[PDB]
Design an enzyme around this catalytic site. Structure first.
Site, PDB file in Angstrom:
ATOM      1  N   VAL A 286       1.449  -3.641  -5.237  1.00  0.00           N
ATOM      2  CA  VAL A 286       2.073  -3.956  -3.712  1.00  0.00           C
ATOM      3  C   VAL A 286       3.432  -2.973  -4.186  1.00  0.00           C
ATOM      4  O   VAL A 286       3.877  -3.553  -4.755  1.00  0.00           O
ATOM      5  CB  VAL A 286       1.819  -4.829  -2.645  1.00  0.00           C
ATOM      6  N   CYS A 287       3.527  -1.998  -2.773  1.00  0.00           N
ATOM      7  CA  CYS A 287       4.936  -1.568  -3.158  1.00  0.00           C
ATOM      8  C   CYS A 287       5.569  -1.364  -3.768  1.00  0.00           C
ATOM      9  O   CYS A 287       4.856  -0.273  -4.520  1.00  0.00           O
ATOM     10  CB  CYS A 287       6.096  -2.828  -2.249  1.00  0.00           C
ATOM     11  N   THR A 288       6.572  -1.399  -4.614  1.00  0.00           N
ATOM     12  CA  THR A 288       7.562  -1.173  -5.825  1.00  0.00           C
ATOM     13  C   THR A 288       6.412  -1.811  -7.007  1.00  0.00           C
ATOM     14  O   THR A 288       6.689  -1.492  -8.525  1.00  0.00           O
ATOM     15  CB  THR A 288       9.039  -0.866  -6.044  1.00  0.00           C
TER      16      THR A 288
ATOM     17  N   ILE B 215       6.069  -3.523   1.339  1.00  0.00           N
ATOM     18  CA  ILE B 215       5.809  -4.829   1.528  1.00  0.00           C
ATOM     19  C   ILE B 215       4.657  -5.464   2.755  1.00  0.00           C
ATOM     20  O   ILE B 215       3.128  -5.983   1.708  1.00  0.00           O
ATOM     21  CB  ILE B 215       7.522  -5.638   1.687  1.00  0.00           C
TER      22      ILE B 215
END
Lengths: 227, 229
Positions: free
Chosen positions: A100-102, A152
């Site tokens: 998820v995200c970075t 996020i």
């Protein structure tokens, strides 16, 4: 025979990237969820929220699903050979390798995005290509057994998608209803495409130092994969 | 800083952790906030999923709060009859700028006497327990009545927290946070509400929650009797 799900819990994690998916997946039958770090014990998130790793790398059972969250702490992980080797070890046989995200930048630094379609947080999306990914501007991107979520809060949409793959659509719908996940956001600023231009400018302005530092880390990580 | 907005979440055994952790990450993104996780003593508190969280302060040592927020979960039934928790909530609600909750946390506000004659919601499966606590039950995801702001079930905490952010600061600030977090949910199914889920799913879920509902009804009527005396 229980489905084994593991999250990488690291210092300066963006905790909602982990805790959103966790509450979704821990609601399922015949699962066991692990919070993995170098040793069990407290791990402080970027907000100061204290979480607790349940297992070391060594004691983690073979995983059906590995999930890498994002956050400020990913820059360190991208140059941590122990973490990258552990991720590779579990990826190979894992049924599903998700971030998820970075967290997808960590997968990238481990060499797991080469030639694959992937996404990340919108502000960092330019860093996928140097890590070998085909960058896709979609909120949840699936390439084979790789599922990446965008920034996020995309972790919730990602986790419901994963739930249906592990089980079936009915099981995912049950969880969606228990979570009352019918979002009615009070503003329409969740993407650079829809937010006011003044809001995009401030968000880009705030992420700039982080992006530059991550541009440098990414190019060292890529060069290691090449050599 | 020493001028920070003071935000407090009640952290109790068998909390539904996302009710807390969702809002926490949104509000912790705001400028110069301090967030407290409050229980009887500092230390570990285990959520219903098994996730371990860490209370940062006791009731006695918690500073006056600008915002108090009560999450929900399986552990709410005990809280509705916990005089020490209820007294802490009432004391803090006397001076807070916002009194909130998410999910069945509003039943705790109700047990504390803070919903009498006020519009409020709660988790859809327990929604009929608002009226005996004196609330006006509203089927909306974030309900506001004066400085009372309640969110509906679990993931409503995110929508709630963005609404609260705009009140504490302004719309531009809440929009920035919405974008920095890239919060743009796009669910793969349309089963997040009993009005939209397949009928069989709503029926499975009501079948599951019935025991809990009948137990919580009796706790709710005891709590209501304490407010009437």
């Amino acid at each position: 025979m229980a489905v084994q799900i593991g999250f990488l819990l690291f210092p300066e994690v963006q905790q909602l990237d982990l805790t959103g998916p966790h509450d979704v997946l821990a609601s399922l039958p015949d699962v066991q969820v692990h919070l993995i770090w170098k040793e069990p014990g407290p791990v402080v998130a970027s907000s100061g929220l204290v979480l607790q790793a349940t297992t070391s790398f060594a004691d983690c059972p073979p995983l059906d699903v590995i999930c890498i969250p994002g956050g400020t702490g990913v820059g360190a992980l991208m140059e941590d050979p122990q973490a990258l080797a552990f991720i590779r070890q579990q990826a190979a046989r894992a049924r599903y390798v998700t971030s998820v995200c970075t967290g997808s930048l960590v997968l990238g630094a481990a060499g797991l995005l080469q030639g694959k379609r992937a996404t990340t947080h919108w502000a960092y999306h330019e860093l996928l290509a140097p890590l070998g990914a085909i960058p896709v501007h979609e909120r949840v991107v699936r390439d084979g057994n790789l599922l990446t979520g965008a920034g996020i809060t995309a972790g919730i949409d990602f986790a419901l998608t994963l739930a249906a793959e592990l089980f079936d659509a009915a099981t995912a719908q049950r969880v969606q209803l228990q979570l009352e996940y019918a979002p009615a956001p009070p503003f329409n600023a969740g993407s650079p495409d829809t937010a006011p231009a003044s809001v995009v400018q401030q968000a880009r302005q705030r992420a700039a130092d982080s992006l530059h530092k991550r541009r440098e880390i990414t190019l060292r990580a890529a060069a290691r994969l090449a050599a």
